[PDB]
Design an enzyme around this catalytic site. Sequence first.
Site, PDB file in Angstrom:
ATOM      1  N   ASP A 180       0.823  -1.204   0.000  1.00  0.00           N
ATOM      2  CA  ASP A 180       0.000   0.000   0.000  1.00  0.00           C
ATOM      3  C   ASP A 180       0.858   1.255   0.000  1.00  0.00           C
ATOM      4  O   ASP A 180       0.454   2.284  -0.540  1.00  0.00           O
ATOM      5  CB  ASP A 180      -0.934   0.026   1.211  1.00  0.00           C
ATOM      6  N   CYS A 214      -1.455   0.269 -14.173  1.00  0.00           N
ATOM      7  CA  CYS A 214      -1.657   0.355 -12.741  1.00  0.00           C
ATOM      8  C   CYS A 214      -2.782   1.366 -12.590  1.00  0.00           C
ATOM      9  O   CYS A 214      -3.810   1.214 -13.238  1.00  0.00           O
ATOM     10  CB  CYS A 214      -0.370   0.743 -11.989  1.00  0.00           C
ATOM     11  N   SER A 215      -2.634   2.394 -11.764  1.00  0.00           N
ATOM     12  CA  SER A 215      -3.699   3.393 -11.737  1.00  0.00           C
ATOM     13  C   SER A 215      -3.481   4.477 -12.805  1.00  0.00           C
ATOM     14  O   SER A 215      -4.368   4.744 -13.624  1.00  0.00           O
ATOM     15  CB  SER A 215      -3.822   4.038 -10.353  1.00  0.00           C
ATOM     16  N   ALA A 216      -2.306   5.103 -12.804  1.00  0.00           N
ATOM     17  CA  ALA A 216      -2.010   6.135 -13.804  1.00  0.00           C
ATOM     18  C   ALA A 216      -1.256   5.568 -15.006  1.00  0.00           C
ATOM     19  O   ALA A 216      -1.166   6.208 -16.049  1.00  0.00           O
ATOM     20  CB  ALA A 216      -1.214   7.272 -13.175  1.00  0.00           C
ATOM     21  N   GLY A 217      -0.709   4.369 -14.865  1.00  0.00           N
ATOM     22  CA  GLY A 217      -0.028   3.739 -15.978  1.00  0.00           C
ATOM     23  C   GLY A 217       1.365   4.285 -16.217  1.00  0.00           C
ATOM     24  O   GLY A 217       1.861   4.256 -17.350  1.00  0.00           O
ATOM     25  N   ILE A 218       2.011   4.770 -15.157  1.00  0.00           N
ATOM     26  CA  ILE A 218       3.387   5.258 -15.275  1.00  0.00           C
ATOM     27  C   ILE A 218       4.327   4.787 -14.160  1.00  0.00           C
ATOM     28  O   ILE A 218       5.533   4.702 -14.371  1.00  0.00           O
ATOM     29  CB  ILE A 218       3.420   6.811 -15.314  1.00  0.00           C
ATOM     30  N   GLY A 219       3.782   4.480 -12.982  1.00  0.00           N
ATOM     31  CA  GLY A 219       4.601   4.186 -11.806  1.00  0.00           C
ATOM     32  C   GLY A 219       5.016   2.732 -11.689  1.00  0.00           C
ATOM     33  O   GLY A 219       6.119   2.359 -12.084  1.00  0.00           O
ATOM     34  N   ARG A 220       4.135   1.896 -11.142  1.00  0.00           N
ATOM     35  CA  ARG A 220       4.407   0.462 -11.080  1.00  0.00           C
ATOM     36  C   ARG A 220       4.532  -0.103 -12.484  1.00  0.00           C
ATOM     37  O   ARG A 220       5.368  -0.962 -12.753  1.00  0.00           O
ATOM     38  CB  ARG A 220       3.296  -0.260 -10.320  1.00  0.00           C
ATOM     39  N   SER A 221       3.686   0.397 -13.382  1.00  0.00           N
ATOM     40  CA  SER A 221       3.720  -0.004 -14.782  1.00  0.00           C
ATOM     41  C   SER A 221       5.093   0.262 -15.399  1.00  0.00           C
ATOM     42  O   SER A 221       5.614  -0.549 -16.168  1.00  0.00           O
ATOM     43  CB  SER A 221       2.638   0.746 -15.565  1.00  0.00           C
ATOM     44  N   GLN A 261       7.629   6.924 -10.725  1.00  0.00           N
ATOM     45  CA  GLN A 261       7.080   8.120 -10.080  1.00  0.00           C
ATOM     46  C   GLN A 261       7.841   8.566  -8.826  1.00  0.00           C
ATOM     47  O   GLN A 261       7.585   9.647  -8.316  1.00  0.00           O
ATOM     48  CB  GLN A 261       5.615   7.897  -9.686  1.00  0.00           C
TER      49      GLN A 261
END
EC number: 3.1.3.48
Length: 279
Positions: A180, A214-221, A261
């Site tokens: 989290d 992921c959520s924004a498609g830049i961090g974990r992605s 990010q």
Amino acid sequence: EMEKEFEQIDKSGSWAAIYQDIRHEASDFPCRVAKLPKNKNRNRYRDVSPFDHSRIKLHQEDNDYINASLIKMEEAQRSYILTQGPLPNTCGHFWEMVWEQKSRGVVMLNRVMEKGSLKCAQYWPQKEEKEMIFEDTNLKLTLISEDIKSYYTVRQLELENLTTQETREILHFHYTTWPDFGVPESPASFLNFLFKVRESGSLSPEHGPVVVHCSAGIGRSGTFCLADTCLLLMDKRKDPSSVDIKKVLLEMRKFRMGLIQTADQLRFSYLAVIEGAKF
Ligand SMILES: [Cl-]
Ligand SMILES: [Cl-]
Ligand SMILES: [Cl-]
Ligand SMILES: [Cl-]
Ligand SMILES: [Cl-]
Ligand SMILES: [Cl-]
Ligand SMILES: [Cl-]
């Protein structure tokens, strides 16, 4: 080699510095389509938009816009589509993209709700007998089976173009245990997850690009694609130690803004590539 660099950076406490260097050096291209008034409700975050030059275009006669980017890594010889977590009104667009781009796999790196907050629409069916129909894009989506493991789930989905009645099997790789807060202590689970996706054939050039979100498609992605690409380069290059993660990430950011990010995610990426290379 990369190990040494890692150790030095860790010792120096300079991850935040290196990361800020990356943000400063990162490409800047126009996102005019993403910012058109008519597309306001197709973007999950106003701060995260696809570049015009690399955006995925929908084919049906309507508005062609989805918040998704084609990341084409020339040297590594692999492509990815990075996209935001679908919204309640863009789930049809999402599956239209998967159809039109001929993707075999979808990689999801978040839970639909995290820390009690919605990060993504429920864009796939949870029960076999309750299929989803996307009337706007004329698609049907059925859960065929799923393999739920402790740190990830793989689902076998059937996507039907209701226009032609052609059907395709889509593999849904859902990493369900990203913490989290911050990043995973160890990259072991993440790496096992990546190898599972690779073993499936979903990343093969015979298929359209894998869709990663992921959520924004830049961090974990970003972490997923970066690690995968760096491991590819290390395996292929004449001199495997010449792989520079910062350079690779800057190359990827030519195709989509903001990949990785946080400094922690940068550090984690290093960790994952190092450990993965050992394997
Ligand atoms: Cl407009
Ligand atoms: Cl979930
Ligand atoms: Cl947690
Ligand atoms: Cl591979
Ligand atoms: Cl996320
Ligand atoms: Cl490099
Ligand atoms: Cl950034």
